[PDB]
């Protein structure tokens, strides 16, 4: 019922209609995680190895 | 994104020689190694299974392995025999006398090194290498034990590549010798741990779709290996031809291996159509749909329905609707979805390839992770204790150096196989 | 005018970056080659549109875009495509091989060996920047990449670009076209490492957008050429604001100005209407009226929900063709008597509404019809967290078996953040809950 | 073969279903969380209506329709009629009643009670919840709500019930209605009256077993269960017998037009928040409503149960009656017992 904010311009306009009313990682942590996986990633394959060379 | 294939022993060479001359009609490369074919979509990916060499040529990326030269002999004789790298026929003279002890410690120890050498040399002329696929039986002495001899030098020098096999289950009904039992059972000890993927083609299944099914009453190993290679035919296709699903052999990995150890496929296959008038009948899809489900068309003999489907892949190929392919697909699951474990949802991953293989307008190929594929593993185990209850055969063995600790750890790490798969079928 | 950067991950991000591009150009009369005949500013100029091209001295129009994936033969084709003179080749970068579905292989493996390149590559068009908006981010949930390197991504872009805001068109997974078991795994995981990073995310699933080409325009079989398209349309919806002149939505704090009031419950359902088949040999066009109160059908939502069973926080109105206000309070007024709508009780019953003259440009050759008027409506609605609760239960069914785990921790997660991740989740949805009923 | 789902297991009317749909032979029962399933027997609390209807090559049907809950709560009624133009404040065969919560409409309540004792007329009250308070003091009536710690429904308790001779007996009648997937009102033609066995007593407002007409209550408190007929379970034939010899007239004109027009009312209202025409998923619903009717033949509404039992005499057609049009009409398989409740008046 209530309109308003009514804006016009060539290209269109726009408005608002109310009804009613109502009633961070820092970039070391981040480098902290990628490092701690690659190791971890490189302890499997080092027990892998380690497992083949036995 | 490059695939490495090798080839181990009389039953590995054999179907590997068919499964090449199988692509390469596919693909469009002649005996000689020029595409002659009228497609772009042949070549997209032809990449991944050849080399191009001068000439404009195509080369398999393919490494023919044996302990004796006979086999290869052949291979070389054969229809596609010219294709192949030369440097990639490495071979010994002494043969492993269907022993797995020979082929893993022994004859093949000695042989070993010569292989790596090549198979370092395909994989330095890869752009980016996405791992191997190896053919080879569990029976016989030379694809069993040097291949996964092979296999855990591979996995030490490329640890971070997929290892794919195709490997042939022994079964008494198409058997050579007595001990495939303890062959088998010492290579599976191997590929539970050395692999990825692995297709469990079993004999007994290929001889009972060649007897019952094709009323064939005297199948030949060529006449199993029809059936074979036709299958690798179908369960590579997304890896040879352009698509979304299993396009590579790590997706697939991720898409059929929810725990690390269950990784031991039944292949399928359809149609399997006896000779006669109703050879030419033509196949609808819905047709297609249960036939690839049937437990006849498996080539592991083992009963779908005494367990339960882990994930599955289906492709089918040649010309047909898309929308049709994915209301009988549906319609499988639906209408047997007790069947299909309930704790992976959408575990069937279905693809379509325009291009059918020769001499079919349309085909189906399957691919399930069941845990009834445990009937196989059970078969052999009962095989194995029969025996080594006594210790009979032993001494062709222990006459190579191996003490029989070493067949009750392979016994044991087996039937630990086998429970995993009881398990998850009860879960 | 300030500028926004659009990064495209994965295939469903790069596939989908195609269509919108593509659609930007013909909207804006800007052609494969980047010649642009209607702008007489030569080599420069702060419009509307410079929100998404930056010019050259040539008078070549260049997309402020980043594509990446980890896997080259999806942007090998942008690259060889038709508006592939569009793009600079530093804009398209391309690893050797993908993330194979697994969310650990995007995020930790593979996005720690690219990341930096990245961010360099994403720099250098910053750097072209007199005012920086921030970044619209498209990529799929069931991608390894999709999925894992865009988190990490999103992570790095509020290190790096701390005060921007950052957007997301996220592609939610359905069976009927996913390649993986593993997509429920994958989205929840990107879901909870993102959701801190994005302050307004479109989610799009899939089975919606399959479903409408499939009723409405008549597709046996939809391809992701046809979604892709029809998603476009919505995208293009979406950022028509920022790229043309008008009062609403004309930067991206007014997104989640308007939109989202609470930050964590920052994920608006889009409704478009009408969906049109070009075949169709008779058409009545639809009114205002018609295409509005289409906007409260679950069948044109881009997921499929029942707002009815929820509350609205939020509601945007955005159409575009012949389109006066008169003719759109007449329409609310009418719903409103008709249809469920309910507000939450600390926000206004109402509607921000933005009105475009032109209608809806369509790709020549394309499924959709041209129509003489459309419109998207963005409505923050609990319902949507009916697509949280559907993803939530797949991943307990397979995770209480830890189905597929080894893959992730063979890459080098942890398995505690399986667990992690489902818990934000489980919190998401009491979130949902405590506003919604 | 249809394949359906039971997560329900204390549902007396759906294990019936369940036996019915099975004993067809056309219809396969899965396990209780497989989600390839045509039909939900779904779970009184917390059914998960967000998972339905994502399962590509299914049909699926619920037997519950979600929203429905704002009819079959009692706070949830009273807000519904009052805040409804369909229904409204003025709405004339629901019982002027007052939502009220521990320690909200209690002040309001005490206006209307006032001149309801300031004005010769009689005002006993009855409060409840989804443990019942019959009362003349309105200090007691607010006390005993917050000593129950709940929410709570404060209603006119009606003082002059249409009672059954012999036995000068208070009731209530059951009336079930089968909703189904294209929103068809569906009337059982049986419905039952649930008796006291005791003499209605306006002087105490205790002895439940005269005020009460639960069936269990009948059971346990009430010397004379049974007596009158079995299991306090008076049904239509009979009823409409009494009416026609004392009464002069019958059940369908002296009660049932009213009846009729209350549940169409009552189902119509909610349809446009409730309705599944449009709906990825289906609903259908049973649902249970209490009438009482006056000296004056007046009919009015007391409560809606959105999952009733049945009377052990009519399980057998009622559960084969929600098969036929709840079911198979939308998985067929390989006279009606029901009224459908229709009217199109033009104004
Ligand atoms: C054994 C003999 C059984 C093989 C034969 C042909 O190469 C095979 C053709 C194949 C036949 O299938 C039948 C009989 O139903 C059969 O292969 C089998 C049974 O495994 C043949 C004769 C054909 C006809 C195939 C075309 C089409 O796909 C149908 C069928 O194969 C399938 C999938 O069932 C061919 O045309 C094959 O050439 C020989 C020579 C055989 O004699 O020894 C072989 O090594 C053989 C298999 O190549
Ligand atoms: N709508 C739409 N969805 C797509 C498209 N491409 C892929 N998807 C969806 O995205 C999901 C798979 O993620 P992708 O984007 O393909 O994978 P990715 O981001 O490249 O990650 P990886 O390939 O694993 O490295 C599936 O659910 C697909 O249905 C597309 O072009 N359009
Ligand atoms: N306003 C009123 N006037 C007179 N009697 C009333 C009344 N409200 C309730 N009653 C009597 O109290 C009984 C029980 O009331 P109520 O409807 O709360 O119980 P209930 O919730 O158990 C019925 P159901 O088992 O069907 O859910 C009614 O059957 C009726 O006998
Ligand atoms: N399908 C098939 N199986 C074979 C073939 N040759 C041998 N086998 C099986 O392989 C086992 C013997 O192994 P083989 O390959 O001959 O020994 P190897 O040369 O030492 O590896 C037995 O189980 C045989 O049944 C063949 O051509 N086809
Ligand atoms: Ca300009
Ligand atoms: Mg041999
Ligand atoms: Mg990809």
Same mark, same amino acid.
Request: a negative charge; proline letters at 4%; hydrophobic letters at 35%.
């Given at each position: 019922?209530?309109?308003?904010?009514?804006?016009?311009?060539?290209?269109?306009?726009?408005?608002?209609?109310?009804?009613?009313?109502?009633?961070?990682?820092?970039?070391?942590?981040?480098?902290?995680?990628?490092?701690?996986?690659?190791?971890?990633?490189?302890?499997?394959?080092?027990?892998?190895?380690?497992?083949?060379?036995? | 994104?490059?695939?490495?294939?090798?080839?181990?022993?009389?039953?590995?060479?054999?179907?590997?020689?068919?499964?090449?001359?199988?692509?390469?009609?596919?693909?469009?490369?002649?005996?000689?190694? =020029?595409?002659?074919?009228?497609?772009?979509?042949?070549? #997209?990916?032809?990449?991944?299974?050849?080399?191009?060499?001068?000439?404009?040529?195509?080369?398999?990326?393919?490494? &023919?392995?044996?302990? #004796?030269?006979?086999?290869?002999?052949?291979?070389?004789?054969?229809?596609?025999?010219?294709?192949?790298?030369?440097?990639?026929?490495?071979?010994?003279?002494?043969?492993?006398?269907?022993?797995?002890?020979?082929?893993?410690?022994?004859?093949?120890?000695?042989?070993?090194? =010569?292989?790596?050498?090549?198979?370092?040399?395909?994989?330095?002329?890869?752009?980016?290498?996405?791992?191997?696929?190896?053919?080879?039986?569990?029976?016989?002495?030379?694809?069993?034990?040097?291949?996964?001899?092979?296999?855990?030098?591979?996995?030490?020098?490329?640890?971070?590549?997929?290892?794919?096999?195709?490997?042939?289950?022994?079964?008494?009904?198409?058997?050579?010798?007595?001990?495939?039992?303890?062959?088998?059972?010492?290579?599976?000890?191997?590929?539970?741990?050395?692999?990825?993927?692995?297709?469990?083609?079993?004999?007994?299944? &290929?001889?009972?779709?060649?007897?019952?099914?094709?009323?064939?009453?005297?199948?030949?190993?060529?006449?199993?290996?029809?059936? /074979?290679?036709?299958?690798?035919?179908?369960?590579?296709?997304?890896?040879?031809?352009?698509?979304?699903?299993?396009?590579?052999?790590?997706?697939?990995?991720?898409?059929? /291996?929810?725990?690390?150890?269950?990784?031991?496929?039944?292949?399928?296959?359809?149609?399997?159509?006896?000779?006669?008038?109703?050879?030419?009948?033509?196949?609808?899809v819905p047709?297609?749909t249960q036939?690839?489900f049937?437990?006849?068309?498996?080539?592991?003999?083992?009963?779908?329905?005494?367990?339960?489907?882990?994930?599955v892949?289906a492709?089918?190929?040649?010309?047909?609707?898309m929308k049709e392919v994915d209301e009988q697909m549906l319609n499988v699951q639906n209408k047997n979805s007790?069947?299909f474990?309930?704790?992976?949802?959408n575990n069937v991953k279905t693809?379509?390839?325009?291009?059918?293989?020769?001499?079919?307008?349309?085909?189906?190929?399957?691919?399930?992770? =069941?845990?009834?594929?445990?009937?196989?593993?059970?078969?052999?185990?009962?095989?194995?204790?029969?025996?080594?209850?006594?210790?009979?055969?032993?001494?062709?063995?222990?006459?190579?150096?191996?003490?029989?600790?070493?067949?009750?750890?392979?016994?044991?790490?087996?039937?630990?196989?086998?429970? #995993?798969?009881?398990?998850?079928?009860?879960? | 005018?300030?500028?926004? %950067?659009?990064?495209?991950?994965?295939?469903?991000?790069?596939?989908?970056?195609?269509?919108?591009?593509?659609?930007?150009?013909?909207?804006?009369?800007?052609?494969?080659?980047?010649?642009?005949?209607?702008?007489?500013?030569?080599?420069?100029?702060?419009?509307?549109?410079?929100?998404?091209?930056?010019?050259?001295?040539?008078?070549?129009?260049?997309?402020?875009?980043?594509?990446?994936?980890?896997?080259?033969?999806?942007?090998?084709?942008?690259?060889?495509?038709?508006?592939?003179?569009?793009?600079?080749?530093?804009?398209?970068?391309?690893?050797?091989?993908?993330?194979?579905?697994?969310?650990?292989?995007?995020?930790?493996?593979?996005?720690?060996?690219?990341?930096?390149?990245?961010?360099?590559?994403?720099?250098?068009?910053?750097?072209?920047?007199?005012?920086?908006?921030?970044?619209?981010?498209?990529?799929?949930?069931?991608?390894?990449?999709?999925?894992?390197?865009?988190?990490?991504?999103?992570?790095?872009?509020?290190?790096?670009?701390?005060?921007?805001?950052?957007?997301?068109?996220?592609?939610?997974?359905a069976p009927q076209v996913?390649?993986?078991?593993?997509?429920?795994?994958?989205?929840?995981?990107?879901?909870?490492?993102?959701?801190?990073?994005?302050?307004?995310?479109?989610?799009?699933?899939?089975?919606?957008?399959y479903?409408?080409?499939?009723?409405?325009?008549?597709?046996?079989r939809?391809?992701?050429?046809?979604?892709?398209?029809? %998603?476009?349309?919505?995208?293009?919806?979406?950022?028509?604001?920022?790229?043309?002149?008008?009062?609403?939505?004309?930067?991206?704090?007014?997104?989640?100005?308007?939109?989202?009031?609470?930050?964590? %419950?920052?994920?608006?359902?889009?409704?478009?209407?009408?969906?049109?088949?070009?075949?169709?040999?008779?058409?009545?066009?639809?009114?205002?009226?018609?295409?509005?109160?289409?906007?409260?059908?679950?069948?044109?939502?881009?997921?499929?929900?029942?707002?009815?069973?929820?509350?609205?926080?939020?509601?945007?109105?955005?159409?575009?063709?012949?389109?006066?206000?008169?003719?759109?309070?007449?329409?609310?007024?009418?719903?409103?008597?008709?249809?469920?709508?309910?507000?939450?009780?600390?926000?206004?019953?109402?509607?921000?509404?933005? %009105?475009?003259?032109?209608?809806?440009?369509?790709?020549?050759?394309?499924?959709?019809?041209?129509?003489?008027?459309?419109?998207?409506?963005?409505?923050?609605?609990?319902?949507?967290?009916?697509?949280?609760?559907?993803?939530?239960?797949?991943?307990?069914?397979?995770?209480?078996?830890?189905?597929?785990?080894?893959?992730?921790?063979?890459?080098?997660?942890?398995?505690?953040?399986?667990?992690?991740?489902?818990?934000?989740?489980?919190?998401?949805?009491?979130?949902?809950?405590?506003?919604?009923? | 073969?249809?394949t359906?789902?039971?997560?329900?297991?204390?549902?007396?009317?759906?294990?019936?279903?369940?036996?019915?749909?099975?004993?067809?032979?056309?219809?396969?029962?899965?396990?209780?969380?497989?989600p390839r399933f045509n039909?939900?027997?779904?779970?009184?609390?917390?059914?998960?209506?967000?998972?339905?209807?994502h399962e590509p090559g299914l049909v699926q049907?619920?037997?519950?329709?979600?929203?429905?809950?704002?009819?079959?709560?009692?706070?949830?009624?009273?807000?519904?009629?009052?805040?409804?133009?369909?229904?409204?404040?003025?709405?004339?065969?629901?019982?002027? +009643?007052?939502?009220?919560?521990?320690?909200?409409?209690?002040?309001?309540?005490?206006?209307?009670?006032?001149?309801?004792?300031?004005?010769?007329?009689?005002?006993?009250?009855?409060?409840?919840?989804?443990?019942?308070?019959?009362?003349?003091?309105? +200090?007691?009536?607010? !006390?005993?709500?917050?000593?129950?710690?709940?929410?709570?429904?404060?209603?006119?308790?009606?003082?002059?019930?249409?009672?059954?001779?012999?036995?000068?007996?208070?009731?209530?009648?059951?009336?079930?209605?089968?909703?189904?997937?294209?929103?068809?009102?569906?009337?059982?033609?049986?419905?039952?009256?649930?008796?006291?066995?005791?003499?209605?007593?306006?002087?105490?407002?205790? !002895?439940?077993?005269?005020?009460?007409?639960?069936?269990?209550?009948?059971?346990?408190?009430?010397?004379?269960?049974?007596?009158?007929?079995?299991?306090?379970?008076?049904?239509?034939?009979?009823?409409?017998?009494?009416?026609?010899?004392?009464?002069?007239?019958?059940?369908?004109?002296?009660?049932?037009?009213?009846?009729?027009?209350?549940?169409?009312?009552?189902?119509?209202?909610?349809?446009?928040?409730?309705?599944?025409?449009?709906?990825?998923?289906?609903?259908?619903?049973?649902?249970?409503?209490?009438?009482?009717? !006056?000296?004056?033949?007046?009919?009015?509404?007391?409560?809606?149960?959105?999952?009733?039992?049945?009377?052990?005499?009519?399980?057998?057609?009622?559960?084969?009656?929600?098969?036929?049009?709840?079911?198979?009409?939308?998985?067929?398989?390989?006279?009606?017992?029901?009224?459908?409740?229709?009217?199109?008046?033009?104004?």
């Open positions: 019922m209530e309109v308003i904010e009514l804006n016009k311009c060539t290209s269109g306009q726009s408005f608002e209609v109310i009804l009613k009313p109502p009633s961070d990682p820092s970039l070391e942590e981040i480098q902290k995680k990628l490092e701690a996986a690659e190791e971890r990633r490189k302890y499997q394959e080092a027990e892998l190895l380690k497992h083949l060379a036995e | 994104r490059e695939i490495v294939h090798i080839q181990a022993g009389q039953c590995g060479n054999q179907i590997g020689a068919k499964f090449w001359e199988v692509i390469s009609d596919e693909h469009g490369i002649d005996p000689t190694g =020029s595409y002659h074919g009228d497609s772009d979509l042949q070549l #997209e990916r032809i990449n991944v299974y050849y080399n191009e060499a001068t000439g404009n040529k195509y080369v398999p990326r393919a490494i &023919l392995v044996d302990l #004796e030269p006979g086999t290869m002999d052949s291979v070389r004789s054969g229809p596609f025999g010219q294709i192949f790298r030369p440097d990639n026929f490495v071979f010994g003279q002494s043969g492993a006398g269907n022993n797995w002890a020979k082929g893993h410690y022994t004859e093949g120890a000695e042989l070993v090194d =010569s292989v790596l050498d090549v198979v370092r040399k395909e994989s330095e002329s890869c752009d980016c290498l996405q791992g191997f696929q190896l053919t080879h039986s569990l029976g016989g002495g030379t694809g069993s034990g040097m291949g996964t001899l092979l296999i855990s030098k591979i996995r030490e020098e490329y640890p971070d590549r997929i290892m794919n096999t195709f490997s042939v289950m022994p079964s008494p009904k198409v058997s050579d010798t007595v001990v495939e039992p303890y062959n088998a059972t010492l290579s599976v000890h191997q590929l539970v741990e050395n692999t990825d993927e692995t297709y469990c083609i079993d004999n007994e299944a &290929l001889y009972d779709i060649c007897f019952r099914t094709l009323k064939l009453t005297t199948p030949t190993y060529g006449d199993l290996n029809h059936l /074979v290679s036709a299958t690798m035919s179908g369960v590579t296709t997304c890896l040879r031809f352009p698509g979304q699903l299993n396009a590579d052999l790590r997706k697939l990995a991720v898409n059929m /291996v929810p725990f690390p150890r269950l990784h031991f496929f039944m292949p399928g296959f359809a149609p399997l159509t006896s000779r006669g008038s109703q050879q030419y009948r033509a196949l609808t047709e297609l036939q690839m049937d437990s006849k068309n498996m080539m592991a003999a083992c009963d779908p329905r005494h367990g339960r489907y882990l994930t892949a492709i089918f190929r040649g010309r047909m609707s007790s069947y474990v309930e704790w992976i949802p693809a379509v390839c325009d291009i059918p293989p020769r001499g079919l307008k349309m085909s189906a190929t399957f691919i399930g992770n =069941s845990t009834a594929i445990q009937e196989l593993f059970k078969r052999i185990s009962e095989q194995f204790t029969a025996m080594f209850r006594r210790k009979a055969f032993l001494h062709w063995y222990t006459g190579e150096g191996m003490d029989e600790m070493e067949f009750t750890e392979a016994e044991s790490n087996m039937n630990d196989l086998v429970s #995993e798969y009881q398990q998850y079928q009860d879960a | 005018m300030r500028e926004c %950067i659009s990064i495209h991950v994965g295939q469903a991000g790069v596939q989908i970056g195609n269509a919108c591009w593509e659609l930007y150009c013909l909207e804006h009369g800007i052609q494969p080659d980047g010649q642009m005949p209607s702008d007489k500013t030569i080599g420069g100029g702060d419009d509307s549109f410079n929100t998404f091209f930056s010019e050259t001295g040539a008078g070549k129009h260049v997309p402020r875009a980043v594509f990446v994936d980890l896997e080259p033969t999806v942007i090998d084709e942008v690259r060889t495509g038709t508006y592939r003179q569009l793009f600079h080749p530093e804009q398209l970068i391309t690893g050797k091989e993908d993330a194979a579905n697994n969310y650990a292989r995007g995020h930790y493996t593979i996005g720690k060996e690219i990341i930096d390149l990245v961010l360099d590559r994403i720099r250098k068009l910053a750097d072209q920047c007199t005012g920086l908006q921030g970044f619209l981010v498209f990529h799929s949930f069931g991608g390894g990449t999709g999925s894992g390197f865009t988190s990490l991504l999103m992570e790095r872009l509020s290190v790096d670009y701390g005060k921007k805001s950052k957007l997301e068109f996220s592609i939610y997974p996913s390649t993986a078991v593993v997509e429920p795994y994958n989205s929840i995981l990107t879901t909870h490492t993102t959701l801190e990073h994005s302050d307004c995310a479109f989610m799009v699933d899939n089975e919606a957008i479903d409408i080409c499939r009723r409405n325009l008549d597709i046996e939809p391809t992701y050429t046809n979604l892709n398209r029809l %998603i476009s349309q919505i995208v293009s919806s979406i950022t028509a604001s920022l790229r043309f002149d008008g009062a609403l939505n004309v930067d991206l704090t007014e997104f989640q100005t308007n939109l989202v009031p609470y930050p964590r %419950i920052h994920f608006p359902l889009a409704t478009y209407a009408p969906v049109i088949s070009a075949e169709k040999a008779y058409h009545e066009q639809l009114s205002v009226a018609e295409i509005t109160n289409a906007c409260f059908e679950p069948a044109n939502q881009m997921v499929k929900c029942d707002p009815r069973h929820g509350k609205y926080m939020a509601c945007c109105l955005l159409y575009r063709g012949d389109v006066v206000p008169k003719d759109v309070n007449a329409a609310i007024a009418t719903i409103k008597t008709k249809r469920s709508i309910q507000f939450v009780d600390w926000c206004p019953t109402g509607f921000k509404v933005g %009105i475009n003259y032109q209608p809806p440009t369509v790709v020549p050759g394309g499924d959709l019809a041209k129509v003489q008027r459309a419109v998207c409506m963005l409505s923050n609605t609990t319902a949507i967290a009916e697509a949280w609760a559907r993803l939530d239960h797949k991943f307990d069914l397979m995770y209480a078996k830890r189905a597929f785990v080894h893959w992730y921790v063979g890459e080098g997660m942890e398995e505690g953040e399986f667990s992690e991740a489902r818990e934000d989740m489980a919190a998401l949805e009491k979130d949902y809950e405590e506003v919604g009923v | 073969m249809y359906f789902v039971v997560r329900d297991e204390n549902s007396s009317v759906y294990a019936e279903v369940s036996r019915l749909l099975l004993a067809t032979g056309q219809w396969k029962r899965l396990r209780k969380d497989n039909l939900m027997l779904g779970e009184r609390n917390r059914l998960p209506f967000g998972r339905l209807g049907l619920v037997n519950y329709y979600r929203g429905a809950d704002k009819l079959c709560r009692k706070a949830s009624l009273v807000k519904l009629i009052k805040t409804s133009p369909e229904l409204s404040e003025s709405c004339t065969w629901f019982p002027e +009643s007052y939502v009220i919560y521990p320690t909200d409409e209690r002040e309001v309540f005490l206006a209307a009670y006032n001149r309801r004792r300031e004005g010769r007329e009689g005002n006993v009250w009855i409060a409840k919840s989804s443990g019942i308070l019959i009362s003349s003091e309105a +200090s007691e009536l607010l !006390d005993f709500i917050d000593e129950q710690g709940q929410v709570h429904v404060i209603q006119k308790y009606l003082e002059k019930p249409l009672l059954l001779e012999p036995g000068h007996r208070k009731f209530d009648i059951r009336s079930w209605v089968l909703v189904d997937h294209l929103y068809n009102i569906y009337l059982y033609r049986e419905g039952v009256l649930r008796t006291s066995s005791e003499p209605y007593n306006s002087a105490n407002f205790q !002895d439940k077993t005269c005020h009460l007409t639960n069936h269990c209550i009948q059971k346990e408190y009430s010397k004379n269960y049974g007596r009158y007929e079995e299991g306090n379970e008076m049904f239509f034939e009979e009823f409409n017998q009494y009416l026609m010899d004392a009464l002069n007239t019958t059940l369908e004109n002296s009660i049932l037009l009213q009846i009729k027009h209350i549940i169409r009312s009552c189902l119509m209202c909610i349809e446009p928040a409730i309705s599944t025409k449009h709906l990825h998923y289906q609903s259908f619903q049973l649902f249970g409503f209490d009438f009482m009717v !006056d000296e004056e033949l007046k009919v009015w509404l007391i409560e809606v149960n959105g999952a009733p039992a049945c009377a052990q005499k009519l399980y057998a057609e009622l559960c084969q009656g929600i098969v036929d049009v709840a079911i198979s009409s939308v998985f067929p398989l390989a006279t009606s017992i029901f009224i459908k409740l229709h009217h199109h008046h033009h104004h």
